[PDB]
Design a protein around this nucleic acid. Structure first.
Lengths: 8, 23, 65, 171, 459, 121
RNA sequence: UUGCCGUUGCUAUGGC
């Protein structure tokens, strides 16, 4: 399983 | 209605009376 | 904002790395430069930026991904 | 596509006139393309009809064909028989062209308005912006036709001319 | 002194508490992580004492309460910090309600013996209408049209609301101050239900534009938009994982959305009276699915407009179990009113026997996460508590609570006390009209208020 | 025998409301009695839906006289309250009518229900 | 415990 992220 | 009654007419008139007071 | 999602994570010990497919969701924007992808994948996977490689990125028709 | 046996029949020419006008087709080439597909499908249904009833080939291929024809939306659910496939006409396919649904659903007030809107990248089927007016919509896809999110009519900022005129009004 | 030492201190103190409480230690630690494993682990339905429940109805000023959301702090084993936003809010339970009067109101429900106590509120009005008339400029701080949903962040820092203004406004928990307004950017992007991913900042918004939106509150940004429903998406539920479930109302498809996979599972009831009567040899064709709640990661339940409550399993597309006319049939219309003919028998024929009789619909349906019990709601005047079988292949009626009178727009449950001895408080928003619209004939006895009942476990 | 007649069963009501609820989305639906009275005289109506539980039912029994004089199919259904939900309006609807348009995207759906309706009558 | 109006207690539920 992968990872999740977000910016700006 | 083969033999209509006045029960609805009474309340319908009452609804008009409520509107009359409101305006 | 812009999201990035990793899928199909395969561990590779004898070349000592991790493979995966990167999906970058960038609404209201053209795309993400490879350097920004590298630095934040370093942040998330928690490796130094130099150890991170990213390539073969194609945007879908209509944009946003 | 393939050319017709006799393109110069007056009845024919009036046929393409009516079809193009009522569906806003660019030229006769689209009509012959659709006619070619209809000829192929009807020939296949014809050949299946020739086969004996309960023939495994007839059953299997006919069933698959009718199910596909239902899915594209040309053939109604209650008409799931190869005879009704044989009864199809080009108008049913042409209705299934995306222009017609953009017009008929109310997003556009004319077939030409639908054409320009579609080619202008204002129309989205689900996640995908479709600029191909000849796109064939299925039953499920029919209900998802909306304005694309990036469109000014679909939730985005005003177009270039709108903001330009607003600016010129500003100063 | 180092942060790791602090964790060592907190862990050491935590163990001392467990030793003071006490095999038992090992079992509890497993129960602490049972949430991560997607299976029910709270079998307490038989322990519940519905009969002795202390029921209470609290009136409020708002007309037509639309939704209620409850926040419960939870101790995080993984850092030993309570989900309370601040030290003052340690072990304080908050409930937030929205109504059609454009108010957001918060109440304190920490004292279960006592009634909810109002703390702060915010009203919207005509002051907040957008002048621009453009969807992307629809960023006014306050609501100007009916508010339909409210959801509290699991962190206890923010509460988010939406409604007929086509807005997602996120409010500060302490002061109810507006920090961000996120337009849906659609003409018919009407928010109908909001669900927070448990112990996460992810928010899922079901909109009447036939789409579902996903949000990250910590970032104040939109993530993805989900499509596949063929009608309005009235309800949405979420659990610790990301696979939120939704219902399509007239579409009649309970829909589970795999966010990680970008794949989607379809569920349809597909029951028809004719066979059902034949196998019997009043059953109403299903109308629409207007509520859904996830009992488990692998199971979920729905409520419909034929009074049918259906149990679902991810493996099976069809319902595994169903209860017909759960809340009963509506009262038959009076004969003196059906027709104006004086002759009584003529009026009776207009009733057409029992053909006109229709069932109650499931206005509210909430299941406590990872438990074997759930609560259903309607305007019948009583909250029904059900218990799921241990095999999760059937459920029965645990009992009823008749305190509530009026339409149950939303149901919430909060628990308190030690692990072994837990007393459950059920909170349900009660209104005089249905949340989506005013279709309901005015039911006698309805009062717009918040219903509260206390249930304890013994034996 | 009953004044509200014929009344659709649980099944036939089902496809009707599906036509009604979508037809509202397409601006093809006129909702309520006076609009029902409106469309019949102008002859732009396919068929008319009536609630059988209407208070009083006689408030709408004039419509069938208009409907069958113009040879327009009509029908009764159990619950007004459901029709408004289909119709999309936040209040009960006792009568509804589908307007005439051969260019509508739903000509087959409307005609499908229309055929069943004629058989019912 | 309620926007307003009552009843019932020393608390619970009836109308708009």
């Amino acid at each position: 399983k992968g990872k999740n992220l977000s910016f700006k | 209605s083969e033999e209509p009654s006045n029960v609805f007419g009474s309340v319908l008139k009452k609804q008009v009376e409520q509107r009359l007071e409101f305006y | 904002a812009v999201t990035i999602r990793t899928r199909k994570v395969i561990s590779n010990p004898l070349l000592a790395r991790k493979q995966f497919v990167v999906d970058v969701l960038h609404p209201n924007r053209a795309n993400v430069s490879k350097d920004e992808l590298r630095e934040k994948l370093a942040e998330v996977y928690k490796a130094e930026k130099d150890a991170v490689s990213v390539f073969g990125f194609r945007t879908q028709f209509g944009g946003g991904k | 596509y393939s050319t017709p046996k006799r393109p110069y029949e007056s009845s024919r020419l009036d046929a393409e006139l009516k079809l193009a006008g009522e569906f806003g087709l660019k030229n006769k080439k689209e009509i012959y393309r659709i006619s070619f597909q209809l000829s192929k499908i009807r020939r296949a249904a014809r050949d299946l009809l020739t086969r004996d009833e309960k023939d495994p080939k007839r059953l299997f291929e006919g069933n698959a064909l009718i199910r596909r024809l239902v899915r594209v939306g040309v053939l109604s659910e209650d008409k799931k028989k190869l005879d009704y496939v044989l009864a199809l006409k080009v108008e049913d396919f042409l209705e299934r062209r995306l222009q017609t649904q953009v017009y008929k659903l109310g997003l556009a007030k004319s077939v030409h308005h639908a054409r320009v809107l579609i080619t202008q990248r204002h129309i989205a089927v689900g996640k995908q912006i479709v600029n191909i007016p000849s796109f064939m919509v299925r039953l499920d896809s029919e209900k998802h036709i909306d304005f694309a999110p990036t469109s000014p009519f679909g939730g985005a900022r005003p177009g270039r001319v709108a903001r330009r005129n607003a600016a010129r009004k500003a100063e | 002194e180092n942060p790791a030492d602090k964790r060592r201190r907190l862990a050491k103190q935590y163990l001392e508490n467990l030793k003071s409480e006490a095999d038992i230690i090992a079992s509890r630690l497993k129960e602490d992580v049972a949430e991560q494993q997607g299976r029910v682990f709270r079998y307490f339905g038989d322990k519940l004492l519905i009969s002795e429940a202390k029921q209470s109805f609290t009136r409020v000023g708002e007309n037509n309460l639309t939704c209620i959301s409850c926040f419960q702090p939870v101790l995080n084993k993984y850092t030993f910090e309570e989900s309370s936003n601040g030290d003052k809010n340690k072990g304080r339970l908050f409930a937030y309600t929205v109504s059609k009067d454009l108010q957001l109101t918060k109440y304190d429900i920490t004292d279960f013996s006592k009634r909810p106590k109002k703390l702060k509120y915010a009203k919207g009005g005509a002051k907040y209408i957008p002048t621009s008339k453009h969807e992307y400029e629809n960023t006014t701080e306050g609501h100007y049209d009916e508010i339909l949903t409210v959801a509290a962040s699991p962190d206890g820092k923010y509460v988010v609301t939406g409604g007929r203004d086509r807005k997602l406004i996120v409010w500060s928990t302490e002061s109810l101050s507006p920090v961000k307004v996120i337009p849906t950017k659609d003409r018919r992007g009407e928010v109908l239900s909001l669900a927070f991913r448990k112990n996460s900042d992810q928010l899922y918004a079901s909109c009447a534009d036939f789409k579902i939106r996903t949000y990250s509150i910590n970032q104040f940004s939109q993530l993805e938009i989900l499509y596949g429903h063929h009608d309005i998406v009235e309800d949405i539920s979420a659990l610790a994982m990301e696979r939120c479930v939704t219902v399509g109302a007239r579409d009649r498809t309970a829909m589970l959305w795999k966010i990680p996979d970008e794949t989607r599972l379809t569920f349809r009831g597909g029951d028809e009276p004719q066979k059902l009567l034949r196998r019997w040899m009043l059953f109403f064709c299903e109308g629409s699915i207007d509520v859904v709640s996830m009992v488990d990661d692998f199971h979920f339940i729905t409520g419909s407009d034929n009074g049918n409550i259906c149990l679902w399993s991810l493996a099976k597309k069809k319902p595994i179990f169903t209860e017909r006319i759960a809340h009963g049939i509506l009262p038959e219309p009076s004969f003196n009113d059906i027709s104006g003919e004086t002759d009584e028998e003529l009026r009776k024929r207009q009733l057409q026997g029992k053909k006109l009789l229709q069932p109650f619909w499931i206005t509210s349906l909430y299941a406590i996460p990872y438990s074997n019990v759930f609560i259903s709601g309607s305007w019948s005047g009583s909250l029904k508590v059900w218990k799921i079988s241990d095999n999760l292949r059937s459920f029965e009626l645990l009992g009823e609570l008749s305190g509530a009178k009026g339409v149950v727009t939303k149901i919430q449950v909060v628990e308190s006390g030690k692990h072994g001895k837990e007393k459950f408080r059920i909170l349900a928003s009660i209104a005089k009209e249905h949340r989506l619209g005013r279709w309901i004939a005015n039911v006698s006895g309805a009062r717009n208020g918040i219903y509260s009942a206390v249930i304890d476990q013994t034996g | 025998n009953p004044k509200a007649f014929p009344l659709a069963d649980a099944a036939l009501t089902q496809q009707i409301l599906d036509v009604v609820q979508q037809a509202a989305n397409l601006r093809q639906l006129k909702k309520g009695a006076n609009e029902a009275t409106k469309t019949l005289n102008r002859g732009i109506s396919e068929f008319i839906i009536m609630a059988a539980d209407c208070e009083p039912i006689e408030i709408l029994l004039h419509l069938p006289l208009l409907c069958e004089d113009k040879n327009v199919p009509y029908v009764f259904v159990p619950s007004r309250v459901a029709l408004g939900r289909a119709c999309g309006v936040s209040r009960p609807v006792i009568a509804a009518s589908i307007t005439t348009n051969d260019a509508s995207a739903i000509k087959t759906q409307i005609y499908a229900v229309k055929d069943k309706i004629e058989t019912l009558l």
